[PDB]
Amino acid sequence: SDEIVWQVINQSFCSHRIKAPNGQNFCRNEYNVTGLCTRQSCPLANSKYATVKCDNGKLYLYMKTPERAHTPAKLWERIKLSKNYTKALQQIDEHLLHWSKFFRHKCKQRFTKLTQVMITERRLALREEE
Amino acid sequence: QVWGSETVASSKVGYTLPSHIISTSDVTRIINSSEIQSAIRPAGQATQKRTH
Amino acid sequence: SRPQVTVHSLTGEATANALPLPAVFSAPIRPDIVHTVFTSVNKNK
Amino acid sequence: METSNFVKQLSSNNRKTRVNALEALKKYLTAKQFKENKQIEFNKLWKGLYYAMWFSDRPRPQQRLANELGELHGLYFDPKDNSTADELTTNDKAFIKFSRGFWKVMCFEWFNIDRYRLDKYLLLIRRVLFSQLKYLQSRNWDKKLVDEYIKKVLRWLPLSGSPKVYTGIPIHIVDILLDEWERLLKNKEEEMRKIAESAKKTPLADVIAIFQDIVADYNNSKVLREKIKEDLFSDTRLVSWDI
Amino acid sequence: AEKILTPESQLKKSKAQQKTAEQVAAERAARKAANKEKRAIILERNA
Amino acid sequence: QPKIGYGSNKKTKFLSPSGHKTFLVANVKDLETLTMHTKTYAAEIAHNISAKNRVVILARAKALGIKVTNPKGRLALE
Amino acid sequence: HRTAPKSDNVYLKLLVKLYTFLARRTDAPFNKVVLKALFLSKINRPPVSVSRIARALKQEGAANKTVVVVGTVTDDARIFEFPKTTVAALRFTAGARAKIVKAGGECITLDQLAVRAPKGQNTLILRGPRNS
RNA sequence: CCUCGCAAGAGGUGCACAAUCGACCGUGAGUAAGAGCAUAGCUGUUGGGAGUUCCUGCCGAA
Ligand SMILES: [Mg+2]
Ligand SMILES: [Mg+2]
Ligand SMILES: [Mg+2]
Ligand SMILES: [Mg+2]
Ligand SMILES: [Mg+2]
Ligand SMILES: [Zn+2]
DSSP states (O other): OHHHHHHHHHHSOOTTEEEOTTSOEEEOOTTOSSOSOSTTTOTTTOSSEEEEEEETTEEEEEEEOGGGSSSGGGOSEEEEOOSSHHHHHHHHHHHTTTOOHHHHHHHHHHHHHHHHHHHHHHHHTOOSOO | OOSOOSSSOOSSTTOOOOOOSSSOSOHHHHHHTTHHHHHSOOOOOSSOOOOO | OOSEEEEEOTTSOEEEEEEEOOSSTTSOOOHHHHHHHHHHHHTTO | OHHHHHHHHHTOSSHHHHHHHHHHHHHHHSSHHHHHSOHHHHHHHHHHHHHHHHTOOSHHHHHHHHHHHHHHHHHSOOHHHHHHOSSOOHHHHHHHHHHHHHHHHHHHHTTTSOHHHHHHHHHHHHHHHHHHHHHHHHHTOOHHHHHHHIIIIITTTTTTOOSSSOTHHHHHHHHHHHHHHHHHHOOHHHHHHHHHHHHHHSOHHHHHHHHHHHHHOSSSOHHHHHHHIIIIITOHHHHHTTO | OOOOOOOHHHHHHHHHHHHHHHHHHHHHHHHHHHHHHHHHHHHHHHO | OOOGGGOOOTTTTTOOTTSOEEEEEOSHHHHHTTSSTTTTEEEEEOTTOOHHHHHHHHHHHHHHTOOBSSOSSSSSOO | OOSSOSOOOHHHHHHHHHHHHHHHHOSOHHHHHHHHHHTOOSTTSOOOOHHHHHHHHHSTTOTTSEEEEEEEEOOOTTOSOOOOOOOEEEEEOHHHHHHHHHTTOOOBOHHHHHHHOTTOTTEEEEOOOOOO
16 A cells, blocks of 8 residues: 555645755655655655654664554664764664665665764753863 | 445445455555566666767 | 454553454545545535 | 464464464364364464464564464474375375465465565465475375375465466465475585485475476466476476486 | 575575576677677678 | 746756755754755745744754855844 | 546556556567557447457457456346356446356456466457447 | 467467448348446537736647
């Protein structure tokens, strides 16, 4: 049913979709790795999916499988990426072993950017402590 | 009882649930399959090489 | 395309009893027909 | 009565219920009453097991559960039955009904599986073939067992070539079978000698004749016939095993 | 703990792609030889 | 006289001289949709946003490293 | 004529996608023919009754062929004896479906036929009379 | 669509429909294996009293 769901979401109301002036579309979905409404992008469209998303200081990895499509409360499995960037990429590749290259590449890029953002918000909010 | 099942009358006079034009919702499963790829000729590059 | 659904008690605890899915949920999901019928019926009020 | 309960428990959202259904199945399967049952109970049980696989979460649990489904075939073996007589035992007939139900249910549900959900079931078919052949090895390939297994199980639907059978299952088994026999039989120089000798012991040359017949028939699909002819007849191990 | 196993579809795809690549390489070699012979024929016709 | 022949190249269409496509932003959640596309896109705070919200949007944008097309608007003039 | 079905039906579009892919990637002209048929309007998709299926099978050597109708199949009470075959078509009326099931035949969607016969082997396409 | 053929072809089989050839019913609208009904959209004509035309593009007589 993923194709049907995607086609309805495409030619009907993807509520998280925002139509930019260029004509490109952006899904507002927080779990979305690539914030662009496409076949590979909407977590709604695709049963198999993954994302790096920041919670507190941690940069967790969220996993989505067709097996837990029912029971959406427990759908997203939460994995802690190690603070070491190399270890984090290794863990992402391991968990995303035998996993389509699109989500893996996008997940790695999102982890890099979130790490940079965490570094730079530490920068902007440096305090006298320590 | 209100709408009916495979072997149960819908309780609406002369009503049956609609049939599916396509038996499978997901076209990716069907297009991939196992036998089609045996039937299919080798693929192209998917990004045409510019000639001339 | 599950076989059955699990009833849930009001307090929240999952109930052992399970009910098979009806045949309605395995029916065509047609945005176009729903859209046309919805426009026609919403014009009434 | 119990069979319906097992089918329901297997098709339960709670993981614990699904696991406990399978654990109790391991005990229920090795009983006289199950043997007495008709093929329809077998088919219902296989539907329940199929849905149990349908709910498996992650690839490692999927491997574990495919191994468990193989073990289910592995259970229906008595060392005594092999020794007593060459003629097949009623336990073995029950095992043949078990395999029949498996392949009927898999043929039925093959088409409804999702794209992402199909990969686990390919592994399941692999492990089921492994366990079914391991049963023949444990029985030492009795002629009666082999004949009735081929005619009742493999000839019925996996290798029937009928239009009803989805062609993907034939391509899948022909990919599986070559590696599966090698799995049963277990440097490369001496390893090949051991494999060759144990292959001479095995009846696989009997099995390949079915694919030969399928390739012979005109009514069968050209896609299936062509792939089988290209994969098997051109294979090297058949030459190595003089087949 | 236990190692993950390759998907059973990716293995089929790898087999098919390997066979296709071998076929394409053979066709390429034959095409190269045919091109040389074709150039010889063209030279003769032009003369 | 306007006509289709004057149409701009697709690769350069809808591009500011800074090289960033303008994307309207209302709140922090809509800002976060442009987290990595900092090179391709630049945010533009909507006209109807209150001054109290604009400073929060600017702070979050600086943290994310996304270029804002109209900062110091309603916090400064022109 | 058309390059895509004027209908906005999701499932017809899915079938068109599958069949255009097969026609692109299959040498057999069957996929091309069915792809072009899928675009046709209602007037250009006349109903092919179970009656015509019976005649098409009575033709010599076609008894075991898979009859294909890009469109709908309608029942015909005029007949008493109907042979067993695995008709394939877009839609099946309740009468036609009951007749096919009763006589040991079976009805499949065009996707199931594509899985069966990606090159259209042993297929027999039929088209209804478009008198008006 | 099936076989043979690397291919051109050799055939086999034949949807719709056409071509002529005829039978029967009653010389055609013929039969000898029907498609229509309903809804909605666009839209041609007949009508009942009954100047220019937001921007761009497209197809195009004489
Ligand atoms: Mg590519
Ligand atoms: Mg390939
Ligand atoms: Mg203003
Ligand atoms: Mg009409
Ligand atoms: Mg004739
Ligand atoms: Zn979307």
